[PDB]
């Protein structure tokens, strides 16, 4: 499910994800607050014509088939009372429905950037001894269409973590949500994500907020063993000199 | 062709049963009554279908009570769970036909009976934003006031059911100093602050041989000196 | 193994090496450099070479009941007769060989002056 935020007197494209092979009629329902889901029209696909309700003239709803087995309901000349959730349906008995698409019709009262802006939190220092755990907190703010989905994933996995959201509280003209997660002891210092799905994100791709966690004596005894054996072959030379010089007097 | 549901909201605890009412009204001779539920992520799921010619339709944990003489039909959800918190729709109704929905009733499922536990609050900052975090507590009588002389904003707490069957709550609040702020709790007649949580046998022969050569050299100096002295007298 | 039977056992508390002929037989006949420099009876298995401090070189081998084994040239430079020729031994060798020659020459001057 997503959102669409067109202004008044404009056109809106509402596509449904219900993929069905060899359909015959595609119904279109509208649900508004405190009312019932009513059918607007239904589109014949073997003849390609819309059959409307007993309430409005043609020139408002148009069913477009861009590819084979894909349908888009185009609304024309949007008024502020056109806003609600739009389903597409098919018979089989039961009647399958198509996951909804909220349409918001505003008077261009945004005038700024309305992307969700995180201001993430970190676990306290005293929680991380006497509980063997730690808790994150991922506060988003200033986003208009209010169809937002926060879910937490691991550092590298495809698991959805046990987050616990809050109510989409309303500021003076924008909105605000926060989600938070508790993780156990031995999976604590890893990376975690706060993936945020929204319509007015940059480049269409949803956000992804990353969350932090002796050989000395042996040589000086034989370098002085060879000096004293070379001062002892000079004293014998001198002893031979003085003995040869003393024996010539006897 | 009318479907009436004069039930705004119901509250029923876990593993109990609940009946939802639906007053339809039509002029056809053979019709079907379908039941749908709507998750808060806006998804419609077919629950049960009661054909108006044969007996009561049941499928698993769903059961339908049918009063053909009156105009009352009734859905039973026995052995409730935690993901039975939706909005339920009654629909009335070959490929071209439409379904006529009612305004819808909301079922909010409450947890079971637990003994009372204690909050054990914490606090976490981001420079100017604070957030008091309250850990698990069973009865929902909480007051999560903070302490600051300099207040800017203070949103409401968000009480949500934990996977243990108790409650957790977060209360944000933006302040200037944001460092000397400590949250307090008045849960269950006993106040809980957040300041109690805050606090070698050949070397010897070589030396012997060198000493022996020293004692030989100090005698071969003495013999040479004594004989050279003899040469002069 | 591949006809490589001799090993040398080391890493003990004392300074000795032991040639271990890992070959099953009786009455192993040791050699050194082609000649039968040794022999052995039973009750002893590892031939002894002496101290590692006396540098046992050579090319040792053995022979079992089968054909003779391949050698193992042992080389041991556990020197201990090494002297350190840095700039404080060759400069303390020109002070025991200049003072001594000058003391001997100032003696020999007086010896020949007396004659």
């Amino acid at each position: 499910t997503k959102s669409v935020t067109r202004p008044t007197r404009s056109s809106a494209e509402i596509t449904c994800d219900l993929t069905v092979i060899n359909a015959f009629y595609i119904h279109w329902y509208l649900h508004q607050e405190g009312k019932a889901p009513q059918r607007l029209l239904y589109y014949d696909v073997s003849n390609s014509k819309d059959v409307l309700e007993s309430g409005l003239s043609p020139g408002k709803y148009y069913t477009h088939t861009p590819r084979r087995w894909s349908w888009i309901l185009i609304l024309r000349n949007l008024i502020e009372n056109d806003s609600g959730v739009y389903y597409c349906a098919t018979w089989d008995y039961k009647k399958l429905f198509g996951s909804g698409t909220t349409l918001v019709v505003t008077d261009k009262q945004l005038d700024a950037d309305v992307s969700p802006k995180p201001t993430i939190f970190l676990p306290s220092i005293a929680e991380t001894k006497l509980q063997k755990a730690g808790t994150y907190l991922c506060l988003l703010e200033k986003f208009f269409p209010d169809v937002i989905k926060i879910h937490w994933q691991e550092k590298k996995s495809n698991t959805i973590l046990g987050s616990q959201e809050g109510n989409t509280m309303k500021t003076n003209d924008t909105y605000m949500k926060f989600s938070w997660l508790t993780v156990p002891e031995k999976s604590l210092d890893k990376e975690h994500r706060c993936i945020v799905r929204h319509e007015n994100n940059k480049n269409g791709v949803d956000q992804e907020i990353i969350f932090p966690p002796t050989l000395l004596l042996q040589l000086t005894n034989t370098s002085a063993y060879y000096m004293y054996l070379l001062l002892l072959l000079k004293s014998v030379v001198y002893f031979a000199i003085i003995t040869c010089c003393l024996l010539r007097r006897t | 062709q009318k479907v009436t549901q004069a039930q705004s909201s119901v509250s029923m605890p876990v593993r109990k049963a609940v009946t939802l009412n639906c007053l339809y009204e039509t002029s056809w001779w053979s019709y079907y009554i379908f039941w749908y539920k709507q998750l808060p992520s806006k998804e419609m799921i077919f629950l049960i279908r009661q054909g108006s010619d044969e007996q009561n339709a049941k499928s698993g944990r769903y059961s339908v009570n049918f009063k053909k003489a009156a105009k009352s039909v009734a859905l039973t959800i026995s052995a409730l769970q935690l993901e039975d918190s939706a909005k339920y729709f009654c629909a009335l109704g070959l490929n071209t036909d439409k379904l006529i929905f009612g305004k819808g009733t909301r079922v909010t499922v409450e947890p079971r009976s637990q003994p009372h536990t204690k909050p054990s609050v914490f606090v976490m900052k981001n420079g100017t934003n604070v957030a008091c975090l309250v850990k698990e507590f069973y009865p929902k009588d909480i007051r999560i006031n903070l302490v600051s002389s300099k207040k800017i904003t203070e949103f409401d707490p968000a009480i949500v059911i934990s996977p243990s069957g108790k409650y957790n709550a977060v209360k944000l609040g933006k302040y200037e100093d944001s460092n000397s702020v400590t949250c307090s709790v008045q849960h269950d007649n006993k106040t809980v602050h957040s300041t109690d949580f805050e606090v070698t046998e050949k070397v010897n022969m070589m030396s012997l041989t060198v000493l022996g050569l020293r004692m030989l050299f100090a005698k071969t100096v003495a013999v040479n000196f004594l004989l050279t002295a003899k040469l002069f007298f | 193994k591949g006809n490589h039977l001799v090993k040398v056992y080391d890493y003990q508390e004392d300074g000795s090496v032991l040639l271990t002929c890992d070959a099953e037989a009786k009455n192993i006949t040791w050699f050194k450099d082609g000649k039968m420099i040794g022999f052995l009876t039973e009750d002893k298995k590892k031939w002894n070479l002496g101290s590692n401090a006396k540098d046992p070189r050579g090319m040792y081998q053995c022979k079992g009941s089968q054909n003779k084994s391949k050698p193992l040239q042992v080389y041991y430079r556990m020197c201990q007769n090494c002297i350190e020729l840095n700039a404080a031994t060759i400069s303390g060798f020109l002070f025991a060989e200049i003072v001594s020659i000058f003391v001997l020459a100032v003696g020999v001057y007086f010896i020949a002056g007396q004659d």
């Binding site: 004596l217 005894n221 002085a224 | 020293r214 100090a218 100096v221 000196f225 002295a229 007298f233 | 025991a96």
Partner: peptide
């Protein structure tokens, strides 16, 4: 440093002993 000092202590002791013998003996 400490084993080397005793091998140049004996040198100045030999030279001082020889000089003060040779200069003492010049008395005759």
């Amino acid at each position: 440093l400490d084993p080397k000092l005793c091998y140049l202590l004996d040198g100045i002791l030999f030279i001082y002993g020889v000089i003060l013998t040779a200069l003492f003996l010049r008395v005759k």
